[PDB]
Ligand binder design. Structure first.
Ligand SMILES: OC[C@H]1O[C@H](OC[C@H]2O[C@@H](O)[C@H](O)[C@@H](O)[C@@H]2O)[C@H](O)[C@@H](O)[C@@H]1O
Ligand SMILES: OC[C@H]1O[C@H](OC[C@H]2O[C@@H](O)[C@H](O)[C@@H](O)[C@@H]2O)[C@H](O)[C@@H](O)[C@@H]1O
Length: 596
């Protein structure tokens, strides 16, 4: 029988955004501003919005998002917050957020709330929201300009040790949130933190890790559950600990830039310790995939520039990758650039993967961090499970010259007992019941499938090696007997202040008590326990926390199945199993099953 338990110690922001599914669908001005190297004129912003309203908003791309080139946004409120995107604009943020509302859309904003504009500093009448004693001028160290060393002289970096700083930062984050912004894209924090860039040299004065982590905590608290926090230049120190604790999205690649295959799949394949750890998103998504999933981070592959690619097969591959990784789907094509490529973004079955909350992982091959061993995960084969137990499976051929067969076996790789019905989502074709998904792919081509296991008597298996991992839980395959490619270890007592855990998203037809099974190993020499909960996306408890018991077994190569019962509500539940301070021993976890 199960006993009551205290809650697990978390190390992630664990917001409704990361719990509820994949990244958002949006449009960004980068397609105009990057090639023009200039801020988007207000009229071009308007024409793009109107085009989105008529052509893509109906496919869920209902955020229009500003980007950089913000040095020329100098007008501020009485408390130093920018009133518009650029000083050339006739209308303020409120006007645009409502013009967007009139078209069933929302405003996305690119800004860093640690920027303090020079013009605000130079107007001594401006003061910190709620702190009339602190002039905006009192928030900065003279000379401490963003990008100082490369000519920057319009934006200061905030000195977070100055009185009024917290109120300034938090007021800036709520300023946008209150305006109706569901998405804040925060860039340049690595330049803030250590004043350097591996692709340039010194850029400005360093501010240090402690200040960086404090600033993030302020942003997190200020954004709350209402506004999604995208971190665009994360240094990802300590396996991304500060970013995981305080953000929803992290960029995992160098900028889209001129786009095309080389940005998507080239440049360099190796890891480096500096922003960006990996240059291309195939490597970046694969490399940071251990940090993805419900309640952890959403990985951000940046912007899709469809007409920068060389073929329609490349365009499909671009989209398939973002979808497979659970990334935001961010269109950067303007109304002038889209040409005949709208179809890339609006395949309903492919979009349905993102809607249902697909967050795939590359096929794990070993426990070694991908940063140390590129053989440890397969950048070209991806799979993830939807809450209802169906799957998204994606296969890629990154060869420039050879046609290559890729396969995911449902028993050997995914760890299922049942096979599944397979639908090719670009062919829009049912392939029937099968034991694998496979494609002979031309160079740069891909395939993506919905795989739907049959459910004899409702039984649904969720393999742990494709679930979400936190607090030191991770993949291994170093004791035989597991179903699939491996299992989850690190569910043991540890140094850190976070508890190791695995989270599964599960979808059930009705409220009730459900039979749950746990395939595990435990050769600690004694019974082990784990804390199990069910929760709503908003974190509300549906069941537990309770200690579940796992009988000791002869060896680590021995597997067994513990039985339990769990109360789940209709629809989406997050079932999280982990090792708290009060739990005993350790387990390795292969899968859970629910009879629904
Ligand atoms: O005004 C800020 C900044 O805008 C432009 O850069 C925007 C890009 O910055 C990268 O760091 C980021 O990864 C990309 O997603 C952004 O689009 C501009 O080029 C730069 O000079 C400005 O300072
Ligand atoms: O604690 C459960 C754990 O037990 C066994 O591993 C013991 C330790 O092995 C070390 O090499 C490793 O670095 C430590 O983290 C382990 O605690 C077992 O082999 C492993 O599979 C189990 O998870």
């Amino acid at each position: 029988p199960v006993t009551a338990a205290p809650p697990l110690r978390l190390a992630s922001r664990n917001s409704v955004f990361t719990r509820s599914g994949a990244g958002p669908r949006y449009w960004n001005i980068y397609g105009y501003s990057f090639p023009h190297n200039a801020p988007i004129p207000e009229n071009e912003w308007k024409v793009n919005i109107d085009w989105l309203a008529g052509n893509f908003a109906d496919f869920g791309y209902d955020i229009a998002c500003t980007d950089g080139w913000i040095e020329g946004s100098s007008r501020t409120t009485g408390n130093g917050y920018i009133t518009s995107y650029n000083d050339s604009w006739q209308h303020d943020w409120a006007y645009w957020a409502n013009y967007l509302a009139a078209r069933k859309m929302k405003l996305g904003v690119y800004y860093n709330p640690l920027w303090v504009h020079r013009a605000a500093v130079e107007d001594a009448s401006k003061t910190v929201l709620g702190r009339p004693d602190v002039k905006i001028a009192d928030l900065v160290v003279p000379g401490d300009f963003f990008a100082r060393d490369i000519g920057g002289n319009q934006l200061y970096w905030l000195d977070v040790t100055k009185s009024g700083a917290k109120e300034y930062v938090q007021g800036y984050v709520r300023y946008f949130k209150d305006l109706g912004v569901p998405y804040l894209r925060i860039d340049f924090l690595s330049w803030y933190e250590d004043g350097r860039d591996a692709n340039i040299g010194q850029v400005n004065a360093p501010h240090g890790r402690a200040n960086y982590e404090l600033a993030l905590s302020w942003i997190n608290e200020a954004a709350g559950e209402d506004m999604e926090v995208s971190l665009v230049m994360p240094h990802m120190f300590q396996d991304g600990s500060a970013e995981l604790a305080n953000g929803d999205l992290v960029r995992i690649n160098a900028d889209a830039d001129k786009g095309g295959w080389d940005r998507l799949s080239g440049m360099r394949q190796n890891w480096q310790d500096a922003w960006p750890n990996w240059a291309n998103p195939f490597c970046g998504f694969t490399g940071w995939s251990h940090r993805n999933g419900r309640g952890q981070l959403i990985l951000d592959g940046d912007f899709m520039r469809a007409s920068t690619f060389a073929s329609d097969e490349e365009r499909k591959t671009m989209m398939n990758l973002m979808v497979a990784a659970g990334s935001p789907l961010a269109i950067a094509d303007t109304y002038q650039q889209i040409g005949n490529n709208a179809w890339v973004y609006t395949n309903k079955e492919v979009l349905q993967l993102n809607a249902d909350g697909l967050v795939g992982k590359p096929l794990y091959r070993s426990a070694t961090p991908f940063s140390k061993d590129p053989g440890s995960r397969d950048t070209e084969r991806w799979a993830g499970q939807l809450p209802d137990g169906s799957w998204g499976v994606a296969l890629f051929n990154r060869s420039d010259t050879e046609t290559v067969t890729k396969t995911i076996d449902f028993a050997k790789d995914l760890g299922l007992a049942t096979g599944g019905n397979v639908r090719d989502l670009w062919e829009h074709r049912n392939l029937g019941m099968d034991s694998r998904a496979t494609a002979a792919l031309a160079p740069h081509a891909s395939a993506i499938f919905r795989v739907t296991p049959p459910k004899m008597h409702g039984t649904t298996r969720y393999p742990a090696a494709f679930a979400a991992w936190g607090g030191g839980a991770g993949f291994n395959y170093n004791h035989p007997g597991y179903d699939g490619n491996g299992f989850v270890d690190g569910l043991q007592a540890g140094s850190g202040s976070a508890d190791p855990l695995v989270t599964f998203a599960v979808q059930v037809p009705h409220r009730g008590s459900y039979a749950i099974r746990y395939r595990y190993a435990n050769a600690t020499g004694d019974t082990s326990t784990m804390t199990v909960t069910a929760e709503k996306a908003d974190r509300s408890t549906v069941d537990g926390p309770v200690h579940v018991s796992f009988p000791g077994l002869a060896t680590w190569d021995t597997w067994g199945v513990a039985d339990g019962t769990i109360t789940l509500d209709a629809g989406l539940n997050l079932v999280t199993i982990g090792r708290g301070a009060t739990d005993k021993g350790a387990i390795n976890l292969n899968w859970i099953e629910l009879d629904m």
